[PDB]
């Protein structure tokens, strides 16, 4: 029953609908995770839920002014947590979230990446390593390999 | 309603659209650079950054988000004799956005079968590998 | 609203006719550069991105795109009879009207109908200036039959 | 439960990192580590690049001294919170010094059952095992592991 | 008319030619650099831009247009024992321009059969692939003694 | 002329003394500032010597490495060398003893040596001469185990 | 007139100086003097050395220079350094190949060793830059 | 007493200085002195060291220098460092190969080991830059009596 989601540490709300978040909800989340210093940049750049989920190292450094690699790592650590527990129902008709989660709960974080390229359960069998890296933004080879393996052993008949 | 005929748009219609999507700040650049429908549909990251002065990667992403919407719900009938728009749309509504890319290289339904992955990327401007692969696959099996 | 004359003998154009065409397509701003650089028909037909940017001072990629849009139109409807003995223009046009634009590129390398069968992909790209892969592939395919 | 023998570095907060820096004679860097908000997780995952550029440790020699201390800490740390399959003891059985790679492997979501499928590239790029000799030994031993 | 013996041209004849083709502007550079017939025939894009100060790619294209004409209608007899000029010309009049490139490497009719594509490009300065291919083809269908 | 000096356990002060003995007192300050002890001395690279210790001349670096090689040849490695690789390397060629710390720092011992590759001896262990690498590798494949 | 069998390998600075005058390169006498160019160095001169060390900035001027040097190399006496008379061997193939003598003998090649030479060796070690020349020299070397 | 072949491996700074004077490189005496070049370092000198550390900016000057050094290397006495007499072995192949002696013995090669040497080793470890030379030395090494 390892549910730290009922803990005080974890940002509120739990199970948030990040894809539909607007600037204001992004602002709230930055405060909770101790990144208030970056509120102004995120506001100016008009980061909403969709952009937050799609944020890259490059955008974070150049457009949002987060110069430290260590600070970016802290940021992505928080964003990965958010992505892991987010509600993707609006954008995830085939429930790729659960498919990824069944492989490993920490793979749920890739949901928006996969649905953003127009992948779904039916198409997943045909996905390539290149696609998972370039299109879906899965940077860890270990993760790519596991997802790829499981995708090839899917029943599409 | 009726879908706008973006391929035939002039500078003035492009200006109107920029206002509607909250990109008024860029009206002057678009005017100076004489962006019409054809050029708007064919706009690249590079042109947006260097020639139109949109320095932020995030702002460009917001812009392309709006442009993709426009491309998705545009009327291509003047330039799309074989109705590639509907073919793409039937595969996935999101693929309609690639209509102008394909017709600009002189592709139509009949020629589509012969297209390569490189061609869809370099010539047609389809950047997502997933999209390329699906379009390629479907093209070979209509043959 | 199409620039006059239609169906022009662009290969034989001098500086003056290039000047007139620039006016018609709304590029009067560039008349001075074209004049200074002494662009005639032959040079206009062979103009590259690089020459347009560096030597003619067209700094914007979007402006260059507008320019090439107009140049492509001119090339598509031009009369190549003086330089195209084997009528490659009609051969290209029969494949797709849009391919007629490549006429000068092919005849400038000394290609004709009879030699076309032997041409390579590299040759069409580097020597003939056919930049679109789709176009190269179609032209290559049709050339291998004849 | 006051003082543990093997420190729970994965669960360390900024303050414990600060204390450790003092003990190892790197007080000079306390401010940078504080400003950059280095906790246990970030300490364990620190790279050459971060140390030089973000923490301002310009000398390669100074960085070597730092990593000498970090490697010791990593070798004797308690990973129980984050290491369900006890990869620490698996690595340790091969060579005590290899226990230092625990956090690198568990951070990618590797465990004993997944070890058989791991590639040399993955050990280098994803897990941060830079010494070829170490990679080769770990790879060899992993080939005799049972998968699912 | 008379075909000029460009291989044997001196600076003065090069100067005259520049005037005739409307490149008087460049007379001084060509004089300073001591361009004779041999150097004129062997002139590269690089030399034209850097050493002779012809900055514009368009201007360089105009120049090479004139040089190609000259090369097409030059007399190569002093340096072309085996008459490669006529062999090239028979293939296509426009190929005569490559005479000096071939004879400068010590090629002749008898050696031509053995030549490689790399050699035609690097050693002989034939830049157009189409031209190279045609010359190569015709060389292989010669007399092989 | 030190007899079996225990360089792996040397502190800053012993490194300082050594620098004096070999006529490199000029570099005492940098070595002090950088806190070079025995372990760091044995693992010193060309890069660290140039950039961190301010030894700009390649010729001076060569002189320095000539002295370091001597020290490494005669050092006592007993604290870090449980399988006595030092004697094994020395028996092959006295000049190979200098590679002891490179090998034991990667956790190698007599029993493991056979599995090492030429790339590993270069990249991991710092054996720069190919001739040396090849000889060590060959002898390692033919050695007696338990 | 045109010098008969000059012993360029044995030339000293003074002879190099004289030759520069004769070919109309007096402007460069100072550089060649300062750099102490003798016969051996003249025969081994590279594009790089000519540009950077001798100050001959123009590619066209360098081309003129090498045109003269090639002539000199073609007519030189190599007897001091060419025991097996590779000069005459090369010359018999084509008079223009004589220019490569010093390149070959400087690597310690002779008639007897020539058969074993590789294309790479002729290019990198001997400084024969023209492929056409390399190929012909290689061919003839295999058949003697 | 004066030896015929100089014992360059054993030369000290003072002998190097003398040699520089004799060959007309007095201009460089100061640099060589400051850098403490002895026989060992002189024999091992590289293009890079000569340019950067000794201040010999001209490639032509460096060529003159190496011309002199090659002669010295060819006729040097290597007996202190060449127990198996590789000098005579190389010399028997071609007198000019004797110049590579110090390169070979510095990697710890001798007659008995020579059979095992690779092309890469002769280039990278021994500093034999001429392909022609490498090939001849390699060939002769393979066909030796082990």
Numbering used by the authors:
A (entry chain B): 392 to 548
B (entry chain A): 404 to 546
C (entry chain H): 400 to 545
D (entry chain C): 401 to 548
E (entry chain G): 404 to 548
F (entry chain D): 403 to 548
G (entry chain F): 402 to 545
H (entry chain E): 402 to 547
Q: What do the study's own words say?
A:
The domain composition of SARM1 includes an N-terminal peptide, an ARM-repeats region, two SAM, and one TIR domain, which mediate mitochondria targeting, auto-inhibition, oligomerization, and NADase activity, respectively. Subsequently, studies have demonstrated that SARM1 is also a key part of a highly conserved axonal death pathway that is activated by nerve injury. Here, we present structural data and complementary biochemical assays to show that SARM1 is kept inactive through a ‘substrate inhibition’ mechanism, where the high concentration of NAD+ stabilizes the tightly packed, inhibited conformation of the protein. In this way, SARM1 activation is triggered by a decrease in the concentration of a cellular metabolite NAD+, rather than depending on the introduction of an activating factor.
For cryo-EM imaging, we generated a near-intact hSARM1 construct that lacks the N-terminal mitochondrial localization signal (26ERL…GPT724) and has a point mutation in the NADase catalytic site (E642Q). We first collected cryo-EM images of the purified hSARM1E642Q. 2D classification and 3D reconstruction revealed an octamer ring assembly with clearly visible inner ring, which is attributed to the tandem SAM domains. Only a minor fraction of the particles (~20%) shows the presence of a (partial) peripheral ring composed by the ARM and TIR domains. Exploring different buffers, pH and salt conditions, addition of various detergents, as well as variations in cryo-EM grid preparation (e.g. ice thickness) did not affect the visibility of the octamer peripheral ring considerably. As it became clear that the compact two-ring structure is inhibited for NADase activity, we considered whether the purified hSARM1, that was not subjected to GraFix and predominantly presents just the inner SAM ring in cryo-EM 2D averaging and 3D reconstruction, is active in vitro. Using a resazurin fluorescence assay modified for an in vitro application, we measured the rate of NAD+ consumption by hSARM1w.t. in a series of NAD+ concentrations and determined a Km of 28 ± 4 µM, with Vmax of 9 ± 0.3 µM/min and Kcat of 46.49 1/min. We therefore measured the effect of NMN supplement on the NADase activity of purified hSARM1 and found a moderate 30% increase in activity with 1 mM NMN, but none at a lower concentration of 200 µM. This demonstrates that the purified hSARM1 is mostly NADase active, even without NMN supplement, supporting the idea of a predominantly open conformation as seen in cryo-EM.
